[PDB]
PDB file of all heavy atoms in Angstrom:
ATOM      1  N   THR A  92       3.025  64.467 -59.040  1.00  0.00           N
ATOM      2  CA  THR A  92       4.405  64.935 -59.051  1.00  0.00           C
ATOM      3  C   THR A  92       5.417  63.808 -59.208  1.00  0.00           C
ATOM      4  O   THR A  92       6.537  64.060 -59.667  1.00  0.00           O
ATOM      5  CB  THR A  92       4.696  65.701 -57.750  1.00  0.00           C
ATOM      6  OG1 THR A  92       3.999  66.954 -57.772  1.00  0.00           O
ATOM      7  CG2 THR A  92       6.193  65.956 -57.545  1.00  0.00           C
ATOM      8  N   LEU A  93       5.049  62.582 -58.843  1.00  0.00           N
ATOM      9  CA  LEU A  93       5.988  61.471 -58.827  1.00  0.00           C
ATOM     10  C   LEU A  93       5.241  60.147 -58.727  1.00  0.00           C
ATOM     11  O   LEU A  93       4.510  59.912 -57.759  1.00  0.00           O
ATOM     12  CB  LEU A  93       6.966  61.629 -57.660  1.00  0.00           C
ATOM     13  CG  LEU A  93       8.042  60.553 -57.493  1.00  0.00           C
ATOM     14  CD1 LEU A  93       8.998  60.544 -58.686  1.00  0.00           C
ATOM     15  CD2 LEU A  93       8.801  60.768 -56.201  1.00  0.00           C
ATOM     16  N   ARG A  94       5.418  59.275 -59.718  1.00  0.00           N
ATOM     17  CA  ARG A  94       4.705  58.002 -59.748  1.00  0.00           C
ATOM     18  C   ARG A  94       5.532  56.849 -59.199  1.00  0.00           C
ATOM     19  O   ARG A  94       5.000  56.019 -58.458  1.00  0.00           O
ATOM     20  CB  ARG A  94       4.241  57.652 -61.174  1.00  0.00           C
ATOM     21  CG  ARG A  94       4.815  58.500 -62.303  1.00  0.00           C
ATOM     22  CD  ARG A  94       4.131  59.852 -62.391  1.00  0.00           C
ATOM     23  NE  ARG A  94       4.983  60.834 -63.052  1.00  0.00           N
ATOM     24  CZ  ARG A  94       4.764  62.145 -63.044  1.00  0.00           C
ATOM     25  NH1 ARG A  94       3.718  62.644 -62.403  1.00  0.00           N
ATOM     26  NH2 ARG A  94       5.598  62.961 -63.674  1.00  0.00           N
ATOM     27  N   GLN A  95       6.816  56.770 -59.537  1.00  0.00           N
ATOM     28  CA  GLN A  95       7.689  55.728 -59.016  1.00  0.00           C
ATOM     29  C   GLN A  95       9.013  56.337 -58.578  1.00  0.00           C
ATOM     30  O   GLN A  95       9.475  57.332 -59.145  1.00  0.00           O
ATOM     31  CB  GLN A  95       7.941  54.624 -60.061  1.00  0.00           C
ATOM     32  CG  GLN A  95       8.931  53.545 -59.609  1.00  0.00           C
ATOM     33  CD  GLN A  95       9.104  52.428 -60.623  1.00  0.00           C
ATOM     34  OE1 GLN A  95       8.157  52.043 -61.312  1.00  0.00           O
ATOM     35  NE2 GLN A  95      10.325  51.907 -60.725  1.00  0.00           N
ATOM     36  N   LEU A  96       9.618  55.731 -57.555  1.00  0.00           N
ATOM     37  CA  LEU A  96      10.963  56.096 -57.129  1.00  0.00           C
ATOM     38  C   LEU A  96      11.749  54.834 -56.801  1.00  0.00           C
ATOM     39  O   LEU A  96      11.198  53.862 -56.271  1.00  0.00           O
ATOM     40  CB  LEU A  96      10.944  57.060 -55.926  1.00  0.00           C
ATOM     41  CG  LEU A  96      10.332  56.640 -54.587  1.00  0.00           C
ATOM     42  CD1 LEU A  96      11.265  55.787 -53.766  1.00  0.00           C
ATOM     43  CD2 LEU A  96       9.972  57.876 -53.793  1.00  0.00           C
ATOM     44  N   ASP A  97      13.038  54.859 -57.134  1.00  0.00           N
ATOM     45  CA  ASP A  97      13.933  53.724 -56.947  1.00  0.00           C
ATOM     46  C   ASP A  97      14.804  53.968 -55.721  1.00  0.00           C
ATOM     47  O   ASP A  97      15.541  54.959 -55.665  1.00  0.00           O
ATOM     48  CB  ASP A  97      14.801  53.514 -58.189  1.00  0.00           C
ATOM     49  CG  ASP A  97      14.006  53.032 -59.382  1.00  0.00           C
ATOM     50  OD1 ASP A  97      13.056  52.244 -59.189  1.00  0.00           O
ATOM     51  OD2 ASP A  97      14.327  53.450 -60.515  1.00  0.00           O
ATOM     52  N   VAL A  98      14.726  53.063 -54.750  1.00  0.00           N
ATOM     53  CA  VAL A  98      15.516  53.144 -53.528  1.00  0.00           C
ATOM     54  C   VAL A  98      16.542  52.019 -53.566  1.00  0.00           C
ATOM     55  O   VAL A  98      16.179  50.837 -53.563  1.00  0.00           O
ATOM     56  CB  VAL A  98      14.636  53.044 -52.272  1.00  0.00           C
ATOM     57  CG1 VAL A  98      15.468  53.191 -51.012  1.00  0.00           C
ATOM     58  CG2 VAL A  98      13.550  54.103 -52.306  1.00  0.00           C
ATOM     59  N   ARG A  99      17.823  52.377 -53.595  1.00  0.00           N
ATOM     60  CA  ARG A  99      18.898  51.393 -53.588  1.00  0.00           C
ATOM     61  C   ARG A  99      19.409  51.234 -52.162  1.00  0.00           C
ATOM     62  O   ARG A  99      19.812  52.217 -51.529  1.00  0.00           O
ATOM     63  CB  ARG A  99      20.023  51.807 -54.533  1.00  0.00           C
ATOM     64  CG  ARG A  99      19.611  51.796 -55.995  1.00  0.00           C
ATOM     65  CD  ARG A  99      20.772  52.110 -56.920  1.00  0.00           C
ATOM     66  NE  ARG A  99      20.354  52.091 -58.317  1.00  0.00           N
ATOM     67  CZ  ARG A  99      20.198  50.984 -59.037  1.00  0.00           C
ATOM     68  NH1 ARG A  99      20.424  49.795 -58.492  1.00  0.00           N
ATOM     69  NH2 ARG A  99      19.811  51.067 -60.305  1.00  0.00           N
ATOM     70  N   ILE A 100      19.377  50.003 -51.662  1.00  0.00           N
ATOM     71  CA  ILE A 100      19.800  49.692 -50.303  1.00  0.00           C
ATOM     72  C   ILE A 100      21.031  48.801 -50.370  1.00  0.00           C
ATOM     73  O   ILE A 100      21.193  47.997 -51.295  1.00  0.00           O
ATOM     74  CB  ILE A 100      18.676  49.003 -49.495  1.00  0.00           C
ATOM     75  CG1 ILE A 100      17.384  49.830 -49.533  1.00  0.00           C
ATOM     76  CG2 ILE A 100      19.114  48.776 -48.051  1.00  0.00           C
ATOM     77  CD1 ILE A 100      17.504  51.210 -48.906  1.00  0.00           C
ATOM     78  N   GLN A 101      21.903  48.945 -49.372  1.00  0.00           N
ATOM     79  CA  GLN A 101      23.146  48.186 -49.299  1.00  0.00           C
ATOM     80  C   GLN A 101      23.245  47.519 -47.936  1.00  0.00           C
ATOM     81  O   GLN A 101      23.244  48.201 -46.906  1.00  0.00           O
ATOM     82  CB  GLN A 101      24.358  49.089 -49.539  1.00  0.00           C
ATOM     83  CG  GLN A 101      25.691  48.368 -49.460  1.00  0.00           C
ATOM     84  CD  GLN A 101      26.871  49.316 -49.552  1.00  0.00           C
ATOM     85  OE1 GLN A 101      27.474  49.479 -50.617  1.00  0.00           O
ATOM     86  NE2 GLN A 101      27.209  49.948 -48.431  1.00  0.00           N
ATOM     87  N   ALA A 102      23.334  46.193 -47.936  1.00  0.00           N
ATOM     88  CA  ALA A 102      23.521  45.405 -46.726  1.00  0.00           C
ATOM     89  C   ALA A 102      24.998  45.065 -46.584  1.00  0.00           C
ATOM     90  O   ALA A 102      25.629  44.613 -47.546  1.00  0.00           O
ATOM     91  CB  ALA A 102      22.681  44.129 -46.774  1.00  0.00           C
ATOM     92  N   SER A 103      25.545  45.279 -45.388  1.00  0.00           N
ATOM     93  CA  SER A 103      26.985  45.183 -45.180  1.00  0.00           C
ATOM     94  C   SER A 103      27.271  44.658 -43.781  1.00  0.00           C
ATOM     95  O   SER A 103      26.751  45.198 -42.803  1.00  0.00           O
ATOM     96  CB  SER A 103      27.641  46.552 -45.382  1.00  0.00           C
ATOM     97  OG  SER A 103      29.044  46.467 -45.233  1.00  0.00           O
ATOM     98  N   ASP A 104      28.113  43.629 -43.684  1.00  0.00           N
ATOM     99  CA  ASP A 104      28.380  42.977 -42.406  1.00  0.00           C
ATOM    100  C   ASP A 104      29.450  43.744 -41.628  1.00  0.00           C
ATOM    101  O   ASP A 104      29.874  44.837 -42.011  1.00  0.00           O
ATOM    102  CB  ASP A 104      28.779  41.520 -42.627  1.00  0.00           C
ATOM    103  CG  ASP A 104      30.075  41.368 -43.406  1.00  0.00           C
ATOM    104  OD1 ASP A 104      30.918  42.290 -43.390  1.00  0.00           O
ATOM    105  OD2 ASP A 104      30.254  40.304 -44.034  1.00  0.00           O
ATOM    106  N   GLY A 105      29.904  43.162 -40.519  1.00  0.00           N
ATOM    107  CA  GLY A 105      30.867  43.811 -39.648  1.00  0.00           C
ATOM    108  C   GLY A 105      32.173  43.054 -39.506  1.00  0.00           C
ATOM    109  O   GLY A 105      32.837  43.137 -38.466  1.00  0.00           O
ATOM    110  N   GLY A 106      32.553  42.311 -40.549  1.00  0.00           N
ATOM    111  CA  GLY A 106      33.820  41.611 -40.568  1.00  0.00           C
ATOM    112  C   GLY A 106      34.936  42.466 -41.145  1.00  0.00           C
ATOM    113  O   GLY A 106      34.735  43.599 -41.578  1.00  0.00           O
ATOM    114  N   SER A 107      36.135  41.895 -41.153  1.00  0.00           N
ATOM    115  CA  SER A 107      37.314  42.607 -41.644  1.00  0.00           C
ATOM    116  C   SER A 107      38.061  41.807 -42.720  1.00  0.00           C
ATOM    117  O   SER A 107      38.751  40.835 -42.404  1.00  0.00           O
ATOM    118  CB  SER A 107      38.261  42.924 -40.489  1.00  0.00           C
ATOM    119  OG  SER A 107      37.754  43.982 -39.694  1.00  0.00           O
ATOM    120  N   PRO A 108      37.945  42.214 -43.998  1.00  0.00           N
ATOM    121  CA  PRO A 108      37.207  43.366 -44.537  1.00  0.00           C
ATOM    122  C   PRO A 108      35.699  43.146 -44.614  1.00  0.00           C
ATOM    123  O   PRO A 108      35.235  42.006 -44.588  1.00  0.00           O
ATOM    124  CB  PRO A 108      37.797  43.528 -45.937  1.00  0.00           C
ATOM    125  CG  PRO A 108      38.199  42.149 -46.330  1.00  0.00           C
ATOM    126  CD  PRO A 108      38.664  41.481 -45.058  1.00  0.00           C
ATOM    127  N   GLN A 109      34.948  44.240 -44.709  1.00  0.00           N
ATOM    128  CA  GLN A 109      33.499  44.154 -44.821  1.00  0.00           C
ATOM    129  C   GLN A 109      33.101  43.538 -46.155  1.00  0.00           C
ATOM    130  O   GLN A 109      33.721  43.800 -47.188  1.00  0.00           O
ATOM    131  CB  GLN A 109      32.871  45.542 -44.693  1.00  0.00           C
ATOM    132  CG  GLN A 109      32.577  45.977 -43.266  1.00  0.00           C
ATOM    133  CD  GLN A 109      31.875  47.326 -43.195  1.00  0.00           C
ATOM    134  OE1 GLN A 109      32.058  48.182 -44.061  1.00  0.00           O
ATOM    135  NE2 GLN A 109      31.062  47.518 -42.163  1.00  0.00           N
ATOM    136  N   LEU A 110      32.058  42.716 -46.125  1.00  0.00           N
ATOM    137  CA  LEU A 110      31.414  42.204 -47.325  1.00  0.00           C
ATOM    138  C   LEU A 110      30.030  42.824 -47.439  1.00  0.00           C
ATOM    139  O   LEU A 110      29.341  43.016 -46.430  1.00  0.00           O
ATOM    140  CB  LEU A 110      31.309  40.678 -47.288  1.00  0.00           C
ATOM    141  CG  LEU A 110      32.638  39.930 -47.186  1.00  0.00           C
ATOM    142  CD1 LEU A 110      32.398  38.425 -47.158  1.00  0.00           C
ATOM    143  CD2 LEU A 110      33.570  40.304 -48.336  1.00  0.00           C
ATOM    144  N   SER A 111      29.624  43.143 -48.667  1.00  0.00           N
ATOM    145  CA  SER A 111      28.399  43.897 -48.884  1.00  0.00           C
ATOM    146  C   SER A 111      27.690  43.406 -50.138  1.00  0.00           C
ATOM    147  O   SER A 111      28.286  42.779 -51.016  1.00  0.00           O
ATOM    148  CB  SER A 111      28.689  45.405 -48.990  1.00  0.00           C
ATOM    149  OG  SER A 111      29.756  45.662 -49.890  1.00  0.00           O
ATOM    150  N   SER A 112      26.390  43.692 -50.193  1.00  0.00           N
ATOM    151  CA  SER A 112      25.575  43.444 -51.371  1.00  0.00           C
ATOM    152  C   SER A 112      24.522  44.542 -51.452  1.00  0.00           C
ATOM    153  O   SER A 112      24.302  45.285 -50.495  1.00  0.00           O
ATOM    154  CB  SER A 112      24.931  42.054 -51.326  1.00  0.00           C
ATOM    155  OG  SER A 112      24.060  41.860 -52.428  1.00  0.00           O
ATOM    156  N   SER A 113      23.872  44.641 -52.610  1.00  0.00           N
ATOM    157  CA  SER A 113      22.904  45.697 -52.871  1.00  0.00           C
ATOM    158  C   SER A 113      21.587  45.100 -53.344  1.00  0.00           C
ATOM    159  O   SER A 113      21.524  43.959 -53.808  1.00  0.00           O
ATOM    160  CB  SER A 113      23.418  46.689 -53.927  1.00  0.00           C
ATOM    161  OG  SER A 113      24.639  47.286 -53.525  1.00  0.00           O
ATOM    162  N   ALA A 114      20.531  45.899 -53.224  1.00  0.00           N
ATOM    163  CA  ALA A 114      19.226  45.534 -53.753  1.00  0.00           C
ATOM    164  C   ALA A 114      18.459  46.805 -54.078  1.00  0.00           C
ATOM    165  O   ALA A 114      18.813  47.902 -53.635  1.00  0.00           O
ATOM    166  CB  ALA A 114      18.427  44.668 -52.772  1.00  0.00           C
ATOM    167  N   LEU A 115      17.393  46.643 -54.857  1.00  0.00           N
ATOM    168  CA  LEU A 115      16.589  47.760 -55.328  1.00  0.00           C
ATOM    169  C   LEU A 115      15.142  47.566 -54.902  1.00  0.00           C
ATOM    170  O   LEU A 115      14.548  46.512 -55.159  1.00  0.00           O
ATOM    171  CB  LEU A 115      16.690  47.887 -56.849  1.00  0.00           C
ATOM    172  CG  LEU A 115      15.871  48.966 -57.560  1.00  0.00           C
ATOM    173  CD1 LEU A 115      15.791  50.260 -56.764  1.00  0.00           C
ATOM    174  CD2 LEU A 115      16.482  49.223 -58.923  1.00  0.00           C
ATOM    175  N   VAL A 116      14.593  48.576 -54.233  1.00  0.00           N
ATOM    176  CA  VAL A 116      13.175  48.662 -53.914  1.00  0.00           C
ATOM    177  C   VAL A 116      12.536  49.623 -54.906  1.00  0.00           C
ATOM    178  O   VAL A 116      12.894  50.807 -54.953  1.00  0.00           O
ATOM    179  CB  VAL A 116      12.954  49.143 -52.473  1.00  0.00           C
ATOM    180  CG1 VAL A 116      11.467  49.188 -52.150  1.00  0.00           C
ATOM    181  CG2 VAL A 116      13.696  48.250 -51.490  1.00  0.00           C
ATOM    182  N   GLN A 117      11.593  49.124 -55.697  1.00  0.00           N
ATOM    183  CA  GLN A 117      10.857  49.947 -56.655  1.00  0.00           C
ATOM    184  C   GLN A 117       9.548  50.367 -55.996  1.00  0.00           C
ATOM    185  O   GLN A 117       8.593  49.588 -55.933  1.00  0.00           O
ATOM    186  CB  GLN A 117      10.610  49.187 -57.952  1.00  0.00           C
ATOM    187  CG  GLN A 117      11.872  48.722 -58.645  1.00  0.00           C
ATOM    188  CD  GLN A 117      11.625  48.283 -60.078  1.00  0.00           C
ATOM    189  OE1 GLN A 117      12.486  48.445 -60.941  1.00  0.00           O
ATOM    190  NE2 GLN A 117      10.448  47.721 -60.336  1.00  0.00           N
ATOM    191  N   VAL A 118       9.503  51.599 -55.502  1.00  0.00           N
ATOM    192  CA  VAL A 118       8.327  52.100 -54.799  1.00  0.00           C
ATOM    193  C   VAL A 118       7.409  52.756 -55.819  1.00  0.00           C
ATOM    194  O   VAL A 118       7.797  53.716 -56.495  1.00  0.00           O
ATOM    195  CB  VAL A 118       8.713  53.086 -53.688  1.00  0.00           C
ATOM    196  CG1 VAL A 118       7.482  53.501 -52.903  1.00  0.00           C
ATOM    197  CG2 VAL A 118       9.735  52.454 -52.759  1.00  0.00           C
ATOM    198  N   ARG A 119       6.191  52.234 -55.926  1.00  0.00           N
ATOM    199  CA  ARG A 119       5.185  52.735 -56.849  1.00  0.00           C
ATOM    200  C   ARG A 119       4.128  53.504 -56.069  1.00  0.00           C
ATOM    201  O   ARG A 119       3.628  53.016 -55.048  1.00  0.00           O
ATOM    202  CB  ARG A 119       4.547  51.581 -57.619  1.00  0.00           C
ATOM    203  CG  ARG A 119       3.378  51.982 -58.484  1.00  0.00           C
ATOM    204  CD  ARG A 119       2.776  50.772 -59.148  1.00  0.00           C
ATOM    205  NE  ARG A 119       1.637  51.131 -59.983  1.00  0.00           N
ATOM    206  CZ  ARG A 119       0.860  50.251 -60.604  1.00  0.00           C
ATOM    207  NH1 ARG A 119       1.099  48.950 -60.481  1.00  0.00           N
ATOM    208  NH2 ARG A 119      -0.156  50.670 -61.346  1.00  0.00           N
ATOM    209  N   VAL A 120       3.791  54.699 -56.549  1.00  0.00           N
ATOM    210  CA  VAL A 120       2.818  55.567 -55.896  1.00  0.00           C
ATOM    211  C   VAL A 120       1.481  55.407 -56.608  1.00  0.00           C
ATOM    212  O   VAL A 120       1.395  55.573 -57.833  1.00  0.00           O
ATOM    213  CB  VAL A 120       3.273  57.037 -55.914  1.00  0.00           C
ATOM    214  CG1 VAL A 120       2.349  57.890 -55.053  1.00  0.00           C
ATOM    215  CG2 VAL A 120       4.712  57.163 -55.427  1.00  0.00           C
ATOM    216  N   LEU A 121       0.441  55.081 -55.846  1.00  0.00           N
ATOM    217  CA  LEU A 121      -0.905  54.944 -56.382  1.00  0.00           C
ATOM    218  C   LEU A 121      -1.650  56.263 -56.253  1.00  0.00           C
ATOM    219  O   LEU A 121      -1.355  57.090 -55.386  1.00  0.00           O
ATOM    220  CB  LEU A 121      -1.675  53.850 -55.647  1.00  0.00           C
ATOM    221  CG  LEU A 121      -0.989  52.493 -55.525  1.00  0.00           C
ATOM    222  CD1 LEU A 121      -1.569  51.743 -54.348  1.00  0.00           C
ATOM    223  CD2 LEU A 121      -1.150  51.695 -56.799  1.00  0.00           C
ATOM    224  N   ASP A 122      -2.642  56.438 -57.119  1.00  0.00           N
ATOM    225  CA  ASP A 122      -3.399  57.677 -57.165  1.00  0.00           C
ATOM    226  C   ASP A 122      -4.491  57.694 -56.099  1.00  0.00           C
ATOM    227  O   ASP A 122      -5.043  56.660 -55.714  1.00  0.00           O
ATOM    228  CB  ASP A 122      -4.014  57.874 -58.554  1.00  0.00           C
ATOM    229  CG  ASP A 122      -4.761  59.185 -58.682  1.00  0.00           C
ATOM    230  OD1 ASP A 122      -4.373  60.161 -58.008  1.00  0.00           O
ATOM    231  OD2 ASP A 122      -5.738  59.238 -59.457  1.00  0.00           O
ATOM    232  N   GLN A 123      -4.772  58.896 -55.608  1.00  0.00           N
ATOM    233  CA  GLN A 123      -5.857  59.177 -54.683  1.00  0.00           C
ATOM    234  C   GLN A 123      -6.722  60.257 -55.319  1.00  0.00           C
ATOM    235  O   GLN A 123      -6.214  61.130 -56.026  1.00  0.00           O
ATOM    236  CB  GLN A 123      -5.293  59.636 -53.327  1.00  0.00           C
ATOM    237  CG  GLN A 123      -6.291  59.822 -52.183  1.00  0.00           C
ATOM    238  CD  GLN A 123      -5.604  60.271 -50.894  1.00  0.00           C
ATOM    239  OE1 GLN A 123      -4.376  60.326 -50.823  1.00  0.00           O
ATOM    240  NE2 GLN A 123      -6.390  60.592 -49.878  1.00  0.00           N
ATOM    241  N   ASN A 124      -8.037  60.186 -55.106  1.00  0.00           N
ATOM    242  CA  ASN A 124      -8.924  61.211 -55.661  1.00  0.00           C
ATOM    243  C   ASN A 124      -8.830  62.441 -54.765  1.00  0.00           C
ATOM    244  O   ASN A 124      -9.644  62.670 -53.867  1.00  0.00           O
ATOM    245  CB  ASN A 124     -10.359  60.713 -55.791  1.00  0.00           C
ATOM    246  CG  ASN A 124     -11.196  61.592 -56.709  1.00  0.00           C
ATOM    247  OD1 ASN A 124     -10.661  62.420 -57.445  1.00  0.00           O
ATOM    248  ND2 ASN A 124     -12.511  61.413 -56.673  1.00  0.00           N
ATOM    249  N   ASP A 125      -7.796  63.243 -55.021  1.00  0.00           N
ATOM    250  CA  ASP A 125      -7.512  64.445 -54.247  1.00  0.00           C
ATOM    251  C   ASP A 125      -7.640  65.696 -55.111  1.00  0.00           C
ATOM    252  O   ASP A 125      -6.973  66.704 -54.864  1.00  0.00           O
ATOM    253  CB  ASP A 125      -6.125  64.362 -53.615  1.00  0.00           C
ATOM    254  CG  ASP A 125      -5.033  64.191 -54.635  1.00  0.00           C
ATOM    255  OD1 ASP A 125      -5.314  63.635 -55.715  1.00  0.00           O
ATOM    256  OD2 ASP A 125      -3.888  64.607 -54.359  1.00  0.00           O
ATOM    257  N   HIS A 126      -8.491  65.638 -56.134  1.00  0.00           N
ATOM    258  CA  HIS A 126      -8.788  66.797 -56.967  1.00  0.00           C
ATOM    259  C   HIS A 126     -10.269  66.791 -57.310  1.00  0.00           C
ATOM    260  O   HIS A 126     -10.775  65.827 -57.894  1.00  0.00           O
ATOM    261  CB  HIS A 126      -7.948  66.808 -58.250  1.00  0.00           C
ATOM    262  CG  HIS A 126      -6.544  67.283 -58.052  1.00  0.00           C
ATOM    263  ND1 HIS A 126      -5.454  66.445 -58.154  1.00  0.00           N
ATOM    264  CD2 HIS A 126      -6.051  68.510 -57.762  1.00  0.00           C
ATOM    265  CE1 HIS A 126      -4.349  67.136 -57.935  1.00  0.00           C
ATOM    266  NE2 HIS A 126      -4.684  68.392 -57.696  1.00  0.00           N
ATOM    267  N   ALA A 127     -10.936  67.816 -56.949  1.00  0.00           N
ATOM    268  CA  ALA A 127     -12.288  67.990 -57.440  1.00  0.00           C
ATOM    269  C   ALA A 127     -12.252  68.680 -58.798  1.00  0.00           C
ATOM    270  O   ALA A 127     -11.334  69.457 -59.081  1.00  0.00           O
ATOM    271  CB  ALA A 127     -13.111  68.822 -56.460  1.00  0.00           C
ATOM    272  N   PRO A 128     -13.219  68.414 -59.673  1.00  0.00           N
ATOM    273  CA  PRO A 128     -13.227  69.098 -60.970  1.00  0.00           C
ATOM    274  C   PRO A 128     -13.244  70.607 -60.783  1.00  0.00           C
ATOM    275  O   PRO A 128     -13.874  71.129 -59.863  1.00  0.00           O
ATOM    276  CB  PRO A 128     -14.509  68.587 -61.641  1.00  0.00           C
ATOM    277  CG  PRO A 128     -15.324  67.976 -60.545  1.00  0.00           C
ATOM    278  CD  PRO A 128     -14.347  67.479 -59.535  1.00  0.00           C
ATOM    279  N   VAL A 129     -12.519  71.304 -61.652  1.00  0.00           N
ATOM    280  CA  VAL A 129     -12.463  72.761 -61.646  1.00  0.00           C
ATOM    281  C   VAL A 129     -13.107  73.274 -62.925  1.00  0.00           C
ATOM    282  O   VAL A 129     -12.872  72.734 -64.014  1.00  0.00           O
ATOM    283  CB  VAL A 129     -11.016  73.276 -61.512  1.00  0.00           C
ATOM    284  CG1 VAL A 129     -10.151  72.763 -62.643  1.00  0.00           C
ATOM    285  CG2 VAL A 129     -10.996  74.798 -61.469  1.00  0.00           C
ATOM    286  N   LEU A 130     -13.921  74.317 -62.786  1.00  0.00           N
ATOM    287  CA  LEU A 130     -14.624  74.921 -63.912  1.00  0.00           C
ATOM    288  C   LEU A 130     -13.712  75.968 -64.541  1.00  0.00           C
ATOM    289  O   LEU A 130     -13.503  77.043 -63.969  1.00  0.00           O
ATOM    290  CB  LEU A 130     -15.942  75.535 -63.447  1.00  0.00           C
ATOM    291  CG  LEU A 130     -16.800  76.258 -64.486  1.00  0.00           C
ATOM    292  CD1 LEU A 130     -17.251  75.316 -65.589  1.00  0.00           C
ATOM    293  CD2 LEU A 130     -17.996  76.908 -63.806  1.00  0.00           C
ATOM    294  N   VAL A 131     -13.159  75.649 -65.712  1.00  0.00           N
ATOM    295  CA  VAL A 131     -12.233  76.554 -66.388  1.00  0.00           C
ATOM    296  C   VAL A 131     -12.985  77.640 -67.140  1.00  0.00           C
ATOM    297  O   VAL A 131     -12.613  78.817 -67.086  1.00  0.00           O
ATOM    298  CB  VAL A 131     -11.316  75.759 -67.332  1.00  0.00           C
ATOM    299  CG1 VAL A 131     -10.253  76.671 -67.944  1.00  0.00           C
ATOM    300  CG2 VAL A 131     -10.678  74.591 -66.598  1.00  0.00           C
ATOM    301  N   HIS A 132     -14.039  77.268 -67.857  1.00  0.00           N
ATOM    302  CA  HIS A 132     -14.795  78.229 -68.638  1.00  0.00           C
ATOM    303  C   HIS A 132     -16.219  77.715 -68.854  1.00  0.00           C
ATOM    304  O   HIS A 132     -16.410  76.531 -69.130  1.00  0.00           O
ATOM    305  CB  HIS A 132     -14.107  78.481 -69.976  1.00  0.00           C
ATOM    306  CG  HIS A 132     -14.729  79.580 -70.777  1.00  0.00           C
ATOM    307  ND1 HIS A 132     -14.376  80.904 -70.624  1.00  0.00           N
ATOM    308  CD2 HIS A 132     -15.684  79.554 -71.737  1.00  0.00           C
ATOM    309  CE1 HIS A 132     -15.084  81.646 -71.458  1.00  0.00           C
ATOM    310  NE2 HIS A 132     -15.886  80.851 -72.144  1.00  0.00           N
ATOM    311  N   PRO A 133     -17.229  78.593 -68.726  1.00  0.00           N
ATOM    312  CA  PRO A 133     -17.146  80.002 -68.317  1.00  0.00           C
ATOM    313  C   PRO A 133     -16.758  80.160 -66.847  1.00  0.00           C
ATOM    314  O   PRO A 133     -17.232  79.402 -65.999  1.00  0.00           O
ATOM    315  CB  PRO A 133     -18.557  80.531 -68.581  1.00  0.00           C
ATOM    316  CG  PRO A 133     -19.432  79.331 -68.533  1.00  0.00           C
ATOM    317  CD  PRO A 133     -18.606  78.199 -69.068  1.00  0.00           C
ATOM    318  N   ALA A 134     -15.901  81.135 -66.566  1.00  0.00           N
ATOM    319  CA  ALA A 134     -15.319  81.267 -65.233  1.00  0.00           C
ATOM    320  C   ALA A 134     -16.400  81.591 -64.206  1.00  0.00           C
ATOM    321  O   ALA A 134     -17.232  82.474 -64.447  1.00  0.00           O
ATOM    322  CB  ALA A 134     -14.249  82.354 -65.226  1.00  0.00           C
ATOM    323  N   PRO A 135     -16.420  80.919 -63.055  1.00  0.00           N
ATOM    324  CA  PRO A 135     -17.403  81.267 -62.025  1.00  0.00           C
ATOM    325  C   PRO A 135     -17.052  82.579 -61.344  1.00  0.00           C
ATOM    326  O   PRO A 135     -15.885  82.963 -61.237  1.00  0.00           O
ATOM    327  CB  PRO A 135     -17.328  80.089 -61.045  1.00  0.00           C
ATOM    328  CG  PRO A 135     -15.950  79.563 -61.206  1.00  0.00           C
ATOM    329  CD  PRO A 135     -15.586  79.773 -62.648  1.00  0.00           C
ATOM    330  N   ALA A 136     -18.091  83.277 -60.890  1.00  0.00           N
ATOM    331  CA  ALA A 136     -17.931  84.519 -60.144  1.00  0.00           C
ATOM    332  C   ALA A 136     -18.989  84.549 -59.055  1.00  0.00           C
ATOM    333  O   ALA A 136     -20.188  84.518 -59.350  1.00  0.00           O
ATOM    334  CB  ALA A 136     -18.052  85.743 -61.056  1.00  0.00           C
ATOM    335  N   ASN A 137     -18.547  84.601 -57.799  1.00  0.00           N
ATOM    336  CA  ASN A 137     -19.447  84.500 -56.657  1.00  0.00           C
ATOM    337  C   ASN A 137     -20.267  83.215 -56.740  1.00  0.00           C
ATOM    338  O   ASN A 137     -21.428  83.172 -56.329  1.00  0.00           O
ATOM    339  CB  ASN A 137     -20.355  85.733 -56.559  1.00  0.00           C
ATOM    340  CG  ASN A 137     -20.983  85.899 -55.184  1.00  0.00           C
ATOM    341  OD1 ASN A 137     -20.806  85.059 -54.303  1.00  0.00           O
ATOM    342  ND2 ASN A 137     -21.721  86.996 -54.995  1.00  0.00           N
TER     343      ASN A 137
END
């Protein structure tokens, strides 16, 4: 359903005025063997 997602984070201090910066976390999703083969045809019955 989703291989990569981009998370944008912002770091910001507590002064007056506030100063801030941004960064990007590139989260990559690895595959897991969570599917067994399915027999499409000929269709199984019992």
